[PDB]
């Protein structure tokens, strides 16, 4: 079956490793949540199409600007991850990750994924963000950003509750196939 | 990999790997620290496994069945014998540190009270210089190696057949020629993330917190040096 490569980018804040692990395991890790992610090849049937989807993380590579681009070769879809409890991580999407991603991969579909949506109604996050003169990322801001960066689409999910996670990886598969 | 070591790290965590009765006699902080040490050894075992697939299954096979020039297989799998010797030796030290920890009369039950020292010797001195020099060579030749594989697979049917044949086993689903080259490149960046999480749950002894802090600083230094000495080749 046709193999497609996926790479996820974004600051450590969003939870790239958590989203990749939750999806590959297809259950929120009960006893132990793994610190690192190696790679994975998930068979997905999306709209009658049998596709092998290779999953890769860019965690740890954040500080190494010469080592990180070695993850990009032949990528068919880029998941551009951000945190709904971290509006600072969203500010890095247009100024840091978009120029780099478009440099190495100019015609690769980018899917702006707003992870940690559950924290929108978590009062410990609303309380902490109030101290920084801030509040959780509104759905209309994540859509405005995806529109500005020229992404294929904007998606939202909760790695903690698995809500939306599967729909992101099926849309990633749709984006890669085109 | 050896049946003994695969079985020892077959569990998804240290809390699952040890006997349930043995686990009951431990503090949450010890269990949490142990799980990350268990993951360090687990992922290092999988790393050496990846390196053996490149040398014995891919490289040795291309020299034997395909009767191909030793310079092309060298450009495809660069420094893999050196990388396999550096990491196998490291895995052997981690695996013997786990064996000393084993309770008398058991093969599953262990608690590693000292890890930091082991990490310091690996990430300092000539072992670290060997790593910096080898990874700087590997990451520079990584891009040339990916282009060299594609040109051979989409030009020669003998290689196209060899690849399909040796990557047919279910286990090599995520370990094809290209995925191995990236798994290796991504391995060095996993250590600071792993050591940082162990250090988070290792304050019960001061000399251990200072050992893991120095090892963490050494891995970050090794990484910063490897990153600086990378020049992409074609």
Curated annotation (Swiss-Prot), chain A:
Its main location: membrane. (Microbial infection) Substrate for botulinum ADP-ribosyltransferase. There is a cross-link at residue 133 (Glycyl lysine isopeptide (Lys-Gly) (interchain with G-Cter in ubiquitin)). Residues 59-76 are annotated as: Switch II region. Keywords: ADP-ribosylation, Cell cycle, Cell division, Cell membrane, Cell projection, Cytoplasm, Cytoskeleton, Disease variant, Ectodermal dysplasia, Glycoprotein, GTP-binding, Host-virus interaction, Hydrolase, Isopeptide bond, Lipoprotein, Magnesium, Membrane, Methylation, Nucleotide-binding, Nucleus, Phosphoprotein, Prenylation, Proto-oncogene, Ubl conjugation. The modification (Microbial infection) O-AMP-tyrosine is found at residue 32. Its cofactor is Mg(2+). Regulated by guanine nucleotide exchange factors (GEFs) which promote the exchange of bound GDP for free GTP, GTPase activating proteins (GAPs) which increase the GTP hydrolysis activity and GDP dissociation inhibitors which inhibit the dissociation of the nucleotide from the GTPase. Activated by GEFs such as ARHGEF2, ARHGEF3, ARHGEF28 and BCR. Inhibited by GAPs such as ARHGAP30. Inhibited by GDP dissociation inhibitors such as ARHGDIA. GTP binds at residues 10-17, 28-35, 57-61, 115-118, 158-160. The modification (Microbial infection) O-AMP-threonine is found at residue 35. Disulfide bonds: none annotated. A motif (Effector region) lies at residues 32-40. GO terms for biological process: actin cytoskeleton organization; alpha-beta T cell lineage commitment; androgen receptor signaling pathway; angiotensin-mediated vasoconstriction involved in regulation of systemic arterial blood pressure; aortic valve formation; apical junction assembly; apolipoprotein A-I-mediated signaling pathway; beta selection. It comes from the Eukaryota. The modification (Microbial infection) ADP-ribosylasparagine is found at residue 39. Its EC number is 3.6.5.2. Gene3D superfamilies: P-loop containing nucleotide triphosphate hydrolases (3.40.50.300). Changing residue 32 to A: Abolishes interaction with DGKQ. The modification 5-glutamyl serotonin is found at residue 61. SMART domains: RAB (SM00175), RAS (SM00173), RHO (SM00174). Pfam families: Ras. It is a lipid-anchor. Interacts with ARHGEF28. Interacts (via GTP-bound form) with RIPOR1 (via N-terminus); this interaction links RHOA to STK24 and STK26 kinases. Interacts with RIPOR2 (via active GTP- or inactive GDP-bound forms) isoform 1 and isoform 2; these interactions are direct, block the loading of GTP to RHOA and decrease upon chemokine CCL19 stimulation in primary T lymphocytes. Binds PRKCL1, ROCK1 and ROCK2. Interacts with ARHGEF2, ARHGEF3, NET1 and RTKN. Interacts with PLCE1 and AKAP13. Interacts with DIAPH1. Interacts (in the constitutively activated, GTP-bound form) with DGKQ. This is Transforming protein RhoA. It comes from Homo sapiens (Human).
Curated annotation (Swiss-Prot), chain B:
It is found in: Cytoplasm, Cytoskeleton; Cytoplasm; Cell junction, Tight junction; Golgi apparatus. Transmembrane segments: none annotated. Phosphorylated by AURKA and CDK1 during mitosis, which negatively regulates its activity. Phosphorylation by MAPK1 or MAPK3 increases nucleotide exchange activity. Phosphorylation by PAK4 releases GEF-H1 from the microtubules. Phosphorylated on serine, threonine and tyrosine residues in a RIPK2-dependent manner. Residues 32-229 form the DH domain. Induction: Up-regulated by bacterial peptidoglycans stimulation, such as muramyl dipeptide and in biopsies from inflamed mucosal areas of Crohn's disease patients. Disulfide bonds: none annotated. The modification N6-acetyllysine is found at residue 150. It is linked to Neurodevelopmental disorder with midbrain and hindbrain malformations: An autosomal recessive neurodevelopmental disorder characterized by intellectual disability, speech delay, mild microcephaly, midbrain-hindbrain malformations, and variable dysmorphic features. Found in a complex composed at least of ARHGEF2, NOD2 and RIPK2. Interacts with RIPK2; the interaction mediates tyrosine phosphorylation of RIPK2 by Src kinase CSK. Interacts with RIPK1 and RIPK3. Interacts with the kinases PAK4, AURKA and MAPK1. Interacts with RHOA and RAC1. Interacts with NOD1. Interacts (via the N-terminal zinc finger) with CAPN6 (via domain II). Interacts with DYNLT1. Activates Rho-GTPases by promoting the exchange of GDP for GTP. May be involved in epithelial barrier permeability, cell motility and polarization, dendritic spine morphology, antigen presentation, leukemic cell differentiation, cell cycle regulation, innate immune response, and cancer. Binds Rac-GTPases, but does not seem to promote nucleotide exchange activity toward Rac-GTPases, which was uniquely reported in PubMed:9857026. May stimulate instead the cortical activity of Rac. Inactive toward CDC42, TC10, or Ras-GTPases. The DH (DBL-homology) domain interacts with and promotes loading of GTP on RhoA. Promotes tyrosine phosphorylation of RIPK2. This is Rho guanine nucleotide exchange factor 2. The gene is ARHGEF2. The chain holds residues 206 to 437 of 986 of the full protein.
């Amino acid at each position: 079956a046709i193999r497609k490569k996926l790479v996820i980018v974004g600051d450590g804040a969003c939870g790239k490793t958590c989203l990749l692990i939750v999806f590959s395991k297809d259950q929120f890790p009960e006893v132990y949540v793994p610190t690192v992610f190696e790679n994975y090849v998930a068979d997905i049937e999306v709209d009658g199409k049998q596709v092998e989807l290779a999953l890769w993380d860019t965690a740890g590579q954040e500080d190494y600007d010469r080592l990180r681009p070695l993850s990009y070769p032949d990528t068919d879809v880029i998941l551009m991850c951000f945190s709904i409890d971290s509006p600072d991580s969203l500010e890095n999407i247009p100024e840091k990750w978009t120029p780099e991603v478009k440099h190495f991969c100019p015609n690769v579909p980018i899917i702006l994924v707003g992870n940690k949506k559950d924290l929108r109604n978590d009062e410990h996050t609303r309380r902490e963000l109030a101290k920084m003169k801030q509040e959780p990322v509104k759905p209309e801001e994540g859509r405005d950003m995806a529109n500005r960066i020229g992404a294929f689409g904007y998606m939202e999910c909760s790695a903690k509750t698995k809500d939306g996670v599967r729909e992101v990886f099926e849309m990633a598969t749709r984006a890669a196939l085109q | 990999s050896m049946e003994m070591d695969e079985k020892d790290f077959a569990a998804d965590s240290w809390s699952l790997a040890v006997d349930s009765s043995f686990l009951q006699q431990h503090k949450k902080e010890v269990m949490k620290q142990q799980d990350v040490i268990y993951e360090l050894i687990q992922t290092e075992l999988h790393h050496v496994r990846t390196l053996k697939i490149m040398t014995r299954l891919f490289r040795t096979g291309m020299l034997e069945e395909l009767h191909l020039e030793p310079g092309v297989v060298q450009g495809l799998f660069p420094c893999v014998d050196e990388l396999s010797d550096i990491h196998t030796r490291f895995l052997s030290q981690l695996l013997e540190r786990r064996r000393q920890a084993l309770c008398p009369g058991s093969t599953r039950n262990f608690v590693i009270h000292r890890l930091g020292d082991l990490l310091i010797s690996q990430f300092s001195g000539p072992s670290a210089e060997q790593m910096c020099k080898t990874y700087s060579e590997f990451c520079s030749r990584h891009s040339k190696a990916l282009k060299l594989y594609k040109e051979l697979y989409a030009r020669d049917k003998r290689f196209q057949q060899f690849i399909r044949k040796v990557t047919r086993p279910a286990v090599l689903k995520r370990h094809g020629v290209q995925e191995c080259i990236l798994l290796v490149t991504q391995r060095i960046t996993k250590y600071p993330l792993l050591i940082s999480r162990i250090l988070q749950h290792s304050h019960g002894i001061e000399e251990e917190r200072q050992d893991l802090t120095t090892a963490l600083g050494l891995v970050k230094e090794l990484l910063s040096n490897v990153d600086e000495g990378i020049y992409q080749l074609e």
